[PDB]
Structures are given as structure tokens and as C-alpha cells.
Amino acid sequence: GADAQAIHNWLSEFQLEGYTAHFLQAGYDVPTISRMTPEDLTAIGVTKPGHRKKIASEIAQLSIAEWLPSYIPTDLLEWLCALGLPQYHKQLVSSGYDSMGLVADLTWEELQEIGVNKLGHQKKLMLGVKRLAELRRGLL
Amino acid sequence: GADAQAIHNWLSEFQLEGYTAHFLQAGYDVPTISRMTPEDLTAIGVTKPGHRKKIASEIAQLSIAEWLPSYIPTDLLEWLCALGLPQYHKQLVSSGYDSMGLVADLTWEELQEIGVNKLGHQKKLMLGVKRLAELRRGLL
Numbered sequence: 450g451a452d453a454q455a456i457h458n459w460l461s462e463f464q465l466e467g468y469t470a471h472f473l474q475a476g477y478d479v480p481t482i483s484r485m486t487p488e489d490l491t492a493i494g495v496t497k498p499g500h501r502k503k504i505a506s507e508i509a510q511l512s513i514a515e516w517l518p519s520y521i522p523t524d525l526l527e528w529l530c531a532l533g534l535p536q537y538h539k540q541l542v543s544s545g546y547d548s549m550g551l552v553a554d555l556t557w558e559e560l561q562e563i564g565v566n567k568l569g570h571q572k573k574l575m576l577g578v579k580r581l582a583e584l585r586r587g588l589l
Numbered sequence: 590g591a592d593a594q595a596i597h598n599w600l601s602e603f604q605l606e607g608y609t610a611h612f613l614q615a616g617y618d619v620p621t622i623s624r625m626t627p628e629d630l631t632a633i634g635v636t637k638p639g640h641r642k643k644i645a646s647e648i649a650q651l652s653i654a655e656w657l658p659s660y661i662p663t664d665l666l667e668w669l670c671a672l673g674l675p676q677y678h679k680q681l682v683s684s685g686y687d688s689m690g691l692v693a694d695l696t697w698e699e700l701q702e703i704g705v706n707k708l709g710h711q712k713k714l715m716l717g718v719k720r721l722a723e724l725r726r727g728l729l
Contacts, residue, residue, distance in 0.1 A: 477709030478673070484712065492708055518713050520660050520671040521720040523727065531660040533618070550728040568632055569617030572624065573658050580661040587663065588690040588725050 452478040463507060471495060480518045483511040525549055532577050540564050553581045592618040603647060611635060620658045623651040665689055672717050680704050693721045 453469065456479060460466035472482060475493040487505050495501045515527070522528035525548055529535045544563045546552045555578050557571075565571050593609065596619060600606035612622060615633040627645050635641045655667070662668035665688055669675045684703045686692045695718050697711075705711050 472709070474707075475709040476707035476713070478713070481709055481713045481716070484716070489708065489712070516720070518672055519717040519720045520662065520668075521717060521724055522660065523720055523723050528660075532658055548727070549724065553728065567614075567616035568629065569612070569615040569621055572629070573616070573618070573621045576621070576624070577659040577661060580656070580659045580663055583663050584661055584689065585725075585728050587688070588693065588728075 455479050456482070459507075459511075460504075463503065465500060465504060465507075468495060468500070468504070478518060479511075480513045483508060483513045522549065525552060528552075528577070532573060534570065534574060537563075537565055537570070537574070549581070552578060553585055554578075595619050596622070599647075599651075600644075603643065605640060605644060605647075608635060608640070608644070618658060619651075620653045623648060623653045662689065665692060668692075668717070672713060674710065674714060677703075677705055677710070677714070689721070692718060693725055694718075 453473060456472050456477075457466045457469045459479065460469055471494050472478075477485070477493070485508060487501055490501050490504060495504060516522055516531065520531070522531055525541070525546075526535065526538055528549060529538050529541075540563050541547065541552070541555075544559065546555050546559075546563075555575075557575055560571055560575075565574060593613060596612050596617075597606045597609045599619065600609055611634050612618075617625070617633070625648060627641055630641050630644060635644060656662055656671065660671070662671055665681070665686075666675065666678055668689060669678050669681075680703050681687065681692070681695075684699065686695050686699075686703075695715075697715055700711055700715075705714060
């Protein structure tokens with residue numbers, strides 16, 4: 450099972466499961482499927498036009514923002530969402546930490562007056578910051 | 590429920606659940622707990638020495654590598670693990686994409702001879718690359 454189950458469910462919603470194995474063999478998972486084109490479907494063997502047409506249409510309705518499967522937060526809100534901390538966004542922005550590049554240099558001391566007061570939230574965040582800086586340094 | 594359930598389970602393994610609510614109130618989740626000190630426990634109100642001693646000991650046994658809760662891959666293997674693609678690591682390294690900084694400039698064409706052949710795997714990876722570069726540009 451796993452993403453097999455997720456795909457098979459999705460496909461089942463319109464009786465086109467049975468194509469499940471196609472997506473698996475090609476190493477697709479739901480979030481990636483969401484970004485397929487028709488040519489992509491053709492390429493993985495969805496060749497019958499009736500079905501390709503349908504599945505494509507069904508894919509344009511698909512949800513999934515956006516940093517899945519990759520797990521690379523491009524922007525601050527995304528990042529705070531992964532970390533499960535979105536309630537702090539507006540505080541951060543009011544205090545001038547409004548981008549990835551900027552949060553990367555957030556420091557422990559700014560923590561009050563920004564108003565993250567729960568200590569597990571402080572720790573979670575500061576760990577994220579730490580790793581984030583580490584990752585940037587990782588480019589040079 | 591959610592991480593409530595995860596914590597409460599963990600704590601239950603040694604009859605110290607009942608402290609669950611402490612961890613919640615402080616906005617702790619399991620991966621963050623794993624990194625607490627004794628002073629951290631004291632600070633969130635685990636004040637009885639018997640229990641602080643025990644919970645600390647139990648925390649040193651805790652698993653959880655490492656990019657959870659943050660979701661910031663410091664290094665290539667981590668990143669490929671989030672993406673669910675670790676089977677491609679050695680191929681990537683044999684081809685000189687052996688760091689984050691370097692994969693950030695991986696391009697679609699190197700894909701064969703590196704030997705990612707499944708097209709959902711190609712797409713997943715190249716999306717990751719794309720977002721990864723985007724994130725770096727995000728620092729300047």
C-alpha cells in the first residue's frame with residue numbers, strides 16, 4: 450500500500466482506478482501526478498484518449514500546494530506551515546522577518562516582542578532557523 | 590488528538606503520560622521533545638526530580654533524525670529521504686552531484702547516465718531541484 454492507496458482512492462472516485470499500477474511503475478505519487486501533463490500520461494502508457502482526457506481533467510481539479518513532494522519551502526508562509534507554526538507569520542512580518550533570506554538570521558533574543566512565548570514553539574522555530582542558515586552556508 | 594496521541598503514547602510506555610498536557614501547553618511535539626534538556630523540562634513545569642530524571646533518560650533513547658520538525662534538509666541524503674528517493678543517492682554521487690549546493694544545478698539532461706529512468710522519479714526530482722534553486726536565489 451501507501452501512496453498506492455492514495456492514488457487508487459483518487460482514481461476510484463471516477464472509476465478509473467485500474468490505472469493505479471501505471472502511476473506506481475512510473476514512480477508517481479499524488480502530488481507529482483497533480484503536475485503531470487497529457488503528454489506525461491501518454492508517456493506512462495495512458496494511451497486511450499477517453500481515459501487520458503478524463504484523468505487530465507481530474508488532475509486539474511487536484512489540490513496539493515505545493516512544497517510537497519519536494520519539501521523545499523520557497524517562501525516564509527510555506528515554511529511556517531511545514532513547521533506547523535503559521536499562527537506566528539503575522540508577528541514575524543510585523544517585526545521585519547518577512548522572507549526566508551531574512552528569517553535565516555533571526556536570533557533567539559528577538560523572540561519576545563515578536564511574541565513567540567510557548568517554549569516548544571521557540572525551540573522548534575530556532576531549530577528551523579539554525580538548520581536554515583546551515584543550508585544557506587551550504588551554498589558556496 | 591494528533592501529536593497529543595504521539596506524546597501520550599510515548600509517555601505511556603513508562604506510565605508517565607499524565608505529563609502529556611504539559612508538553613502540549615508548551616507547544617512541544619515529539620521531534621522537538623527529543624531535543625529538550627532537563628532545564629527545558631523544568632521550565633515547562635516538570636519539576637518533580639523523580640519524573641524529570643526519568644523523562645530525560647527516556648528522551649536520550651528517542652529516535653527521530655533530524656530534519657523533522659523543521660523540514661530543512663541540510664544534506665543530500667536527508668533531502669533525497671524527504672523526497673522519498675534515497676535509492677538514487679549513490680547514482681548522484683557517482684556523477685558528482687554530491688551536495689545540496691551542487692544538486693541545485695542539476696539539469697534535466699544529465700538524467701540518464703545518472704540513471705533515474707522512471708519518469709515520475711525524474712519529475713519529482715527535477716521539481717525538487719527547481720524549488721531548491723529558487724530557494725537559494727531567495728538569499729541575496
